[PDB]
Design an enzyme around this catalytic site. Structure first.
Site, PDB file in Angstrom:
ATOM      1  N   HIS B  69       0.821  -1.238   0.000  1.00  0.00           N
ATOM      2  CA  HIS B  69       0.000   0.000   0.000  1.00  0.00           C
ATOM      3  C   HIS B  69       0.829   1.249   0.000  1.00  0.00           C
ATOM      4  O   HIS B  69       0.302   2.305  -0.228  1.00  0.00           O
ATOM      5  CB  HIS B  69      -1.044   0.050   1.131  1.00  0.00           C
ATOM      6  CG  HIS B  69      -0.456   0.224   2.518  1.00  0.00           C
ATOM      7  ND1 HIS B  69      -0.158  -0.823   3.317  1.00  0.00           N
ATOM      8  CD2 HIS B  69      -0.153   1.380   3.258  1.00  0.00           C
ATOM      9  CE1 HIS B  69       0.319  -0.376   4.502  1.00  0.00           C
ATOM     10  NE2 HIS B  69       0.328   0.972   4.466  1.00  0.00           N
ATOM     11  N   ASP B  93       0.070  -7.698   1.156  1.00  0.00           N
ATOM     12  CA  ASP B  93       0.514  -6.288   1.275  1.00  0.00           C
ATOM     13  C   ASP B  93       2.053  -6.202   1.363  1.00  0.00           C
ATOM     14  O   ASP B  93       2.616  -5.432   2.129  1.00  0.00           O
ATOM     15  CB  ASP B  93      -0.148  -5.600   2.488  1.00  0.00           C
ATOM     16  CG  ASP B  93      -0.069  -4.085   2.418  1.00  0.00           C
ATOM     17  OD1 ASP B  93       0.167  -3.547   1.328  1.00  0.00           O
ATOM     18  OD2 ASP B  93      -0.249  -3.417   3.456  1.00  0.00           O
ATOM     19  N   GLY B 145       4.117   7.347   9.163  1.00  0.00           N
ATOM     20  CA  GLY B 145       5.289   7.163   8.327  1.00  0.00           C
ATOM     21  C   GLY B 145       6.133   5.931   8.618  1.00  0.00           C
ATOM     22  O   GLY B 145       7.158   5.742   7.976  1.00  0.00           O
ATOM     23  N   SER B 147       5.037   2.606   8.369  1.00  0.00           N
ATOM     24  CA  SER B 147       4.634   1.407   7.589  1.00  0.00           C
ATOM     25  C   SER B 147       5.841   0.810   6.867  1.00  0.00           C
ATOM     26  O   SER B 147       6.624   1.535   6.254  1.00  0.00           O
ATOM     27  CB  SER B 147       3.589   1.761   6.558  1.00  0.00           C
ATOM     28  OG  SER B 147       2.451   2.314   7.168  1.00  0.00           O
TER      29      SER B 147
END
Ligand SMILES: [Cl-]
Ligand SMILES: [Cl-]
Lengths: 17, 188
Positions: B69, B93, B145, B147
């Site tokens: 993502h 993901d 920020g 991820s």
């Protein structure tokens, strides 16, 4: 509850208003 | 445009970390358009950005891994031009590029440690396969920020990469992650 994605704005230190 | 490394987090007794910026906003935009990144790479965790968003990437066994993502299907800007994703697993993901030469790879691994965008190390308790709880709740803004950041075991081996936070009223209580196992399942 809420499921949050954690992207920030562009760049090393992203700018906010 | 490509994903561009704009900084790095270098990891260490107990687990410590610090951050270092490597690129500015303009060089980020330009490097995104050219896919050519001639900077030296260092550390185990890269701070990465497209022209619209930034997040983290974690190097585990010579693969630089991050969240789909964040990165989508994009190339990573590299010294010989853009680097095609080696792994692209949309349902998990997860994506990965071959790690650039200078990056420091972590190796695979129940008190865990999350390394955030600001290079804070925060204790996490594993609560099943792909979920952990925060032992000390913090605002979700503190995780903005992060991820694609690593979850470490106490010896500093990699357990997974951070994906999303479970939140109640702006407070992050639990983290959702991609297990190091899913990287192995992906890799074959
Ligand atoms: Cl492009
Ligand atoms: Cl730059």
């Amino acid at each position: 509850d809420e499921l949050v994605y954690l992207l920030d704005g562009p760049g090393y230190d992203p700018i906010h208003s | 445009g490509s994903v561009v490394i704009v900084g790095r987090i270098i990891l260490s007794g107990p687990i410590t970390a610090y951050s270092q910026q490597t690129r500015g906003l303009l060089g980020c935009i330009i490097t995104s358009l050219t896919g050519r990144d001639r900077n030296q790479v260092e550390g185990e965790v890269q701070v990465v950005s497209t022209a619209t968003q930034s997040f983290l990437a974690t190097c585990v066994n010579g693969v630089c891994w991050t969240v789909y993502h964040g990165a989508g299907s994009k190339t990573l800007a590299g010294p010989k031009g853009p680097i095609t994703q080696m792994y692209t697993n949309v349902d998990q993901d997860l994506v990965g590029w071959q790690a650039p030469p200078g990056a420091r790879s972590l190796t695979p691994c129940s008190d865990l440690y999350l390394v955030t965008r600001h290079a804070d190390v925060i204790p996490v308790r594993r609560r099943g396969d792909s979920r952990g709880s925060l032992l000390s709740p913090r605002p979700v803004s503190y995780l903005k920020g992060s991820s694609g950041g690593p979850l470490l075991c106490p010896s500093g081996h990699a357990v997974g990469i951070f994906r999303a936070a479970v939140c109640t009223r702006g407070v992050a209580k639990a983290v959702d992650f991609v297990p190091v196992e899913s990287m192995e399942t992906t890799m074959r």
